[PDB]
């Protein structure tokens, strides 16, 4: 070295005499032979230009090794609010996956289910489901790369399905639309097409770009045409994911087993989880001690789009929080601690001006509320509790203001029966029933526990709780009762009888009843008005006067009177 012949430049590079001449003949470099000298500027202008061209020869190698992209997933979720004939879609695809026999093959509820065709795999999401808008958006995680949209022939595009489409969209997708119930009498797939077309979702028979398929979620019809098609659209939009790359999936839900201990159900989205790996989910970490699947088996491995029960985490990480791989316990702690530093700092931000802002109060429980009833909430479903909050913040009509304390997703527990004690509150659940112990604690402690099918059930039982005593009673049940005291058979009067009130008022503007020690005497209205002092036109607070009682005859001191109207008087 220090100096060079072009023949040595070639044995060093690992390039032909003529290749290196070809390189110099594109550069516009003057030369005599491969024994010629180069200039310091001209050998260095070869060295530097090689950095752009190598960086591109690896970009056109990462964008190609990333093209020959494996078997996938490529998940999908279906959308709207509760009692929507939306489980009914899921019901039908959860059975059309195994057309065959019982079973054998135990069909377990892993947050999802494989639907196994001739070229690969598509996994359909099996969970609530409604999403109920559990989170409106994560904003978000992208748990599934296809989304199968059901429009129901009985109901059509209820608003939750246009929000649902907007989760498929903003989650970076071309979209599949399923038309269920084509077998039912009142079924009009062309209304659905014109519903899709006034929204921009133009079908392929109208020269658009949004695929349509008539199917029956109870036959078995069009679910074939729907499967091949989902393989086509997977091809066309070219959504596949890697299986070697730093791992990624989603929690579907989390709970207990006597035998197993701490449990949670995980979709692996990307890469592979195995027994003995260390993991992180949310602020929660732990070691995979065991794995259990849909088919009830103990799993030595879980590959992409595997749903499983996982033994390993220290705390119970939340429904739809992402699970992620980490190099070491140091990363598992420090990642958990910055998200904890962020969410605690910001949750301290959030304290001010927050007793105000909203300004009811810190949900209203120190205003005289003039008929107060309270709540804490216990949903299954993050999407019910959003929907509940969206309904109820507007339903505050009759005087009482809804106070909604800190809430979660999943089943009842013994925390709710110590918060509802200290806050004097009601515990509202839907989808989810209370567990074993937890109803037996609640029902022997006097908290007004409730379960409902429809969120409209719950809210129209929240009405109840707007029973503000005096006015929503609406019974006309006696406006007063008054004991007789005397009567003036005075020859300057008529027939006025002292009466002492025992309800609201006795008025000159009012109807009259008379109730004996065993008999109804008589019924009518006030005609006269006389005191031992003067002929006054009203009596107010508890004072005495003589009133007149139509045609009567069982005079002087017979017994108590009972006058009624409306709250007017």
Curated annotation (Swiss-Prot):
MF terms in GO: GTP binding; GTPase activity; translation initiation factor activity
Chain intervals for the UniProt region annotation (G3): 126-129
Location of the region described as G4 in the Swiss-Prot/TrEMBL record: 180-183
Entry GO terms, CC: cytosol
Residues covered by region (G1): 80-87
Location of region: G2: 105-109
Domain tr-type G, chain residue ranges per copy: 71-239
Family matches, as Pfam families: EF-G_D2, GTP_EFTU, GTP_EFTU_D2, IF-2, IF2_N
Superkingdom as given in the UniProt entry: Bacteria
Subcellular location: Cytoplasm
Protein name: Translation initiation factor IF-2
Protein's UniProt keywords contain Protein biosynthesis: yes
InterPro entries: EF-G-like_DII, EFTu-like_2, IF2_II, IF2_N, P-loop_NTPase, Small_GTP-bd, T_Tr_GTP-bd_dom, TF_IF2_bacterial-like
Species this protein is from: Thermus thermophilus (strain ATCC 27634 / DSM 579 / HB8)
Residue segments, region G5: 216-218
Disulphide bond pairs: none
Binding site for GTP: 80-87, 126-130, 180-183
Coiled-coil annotated spans: none
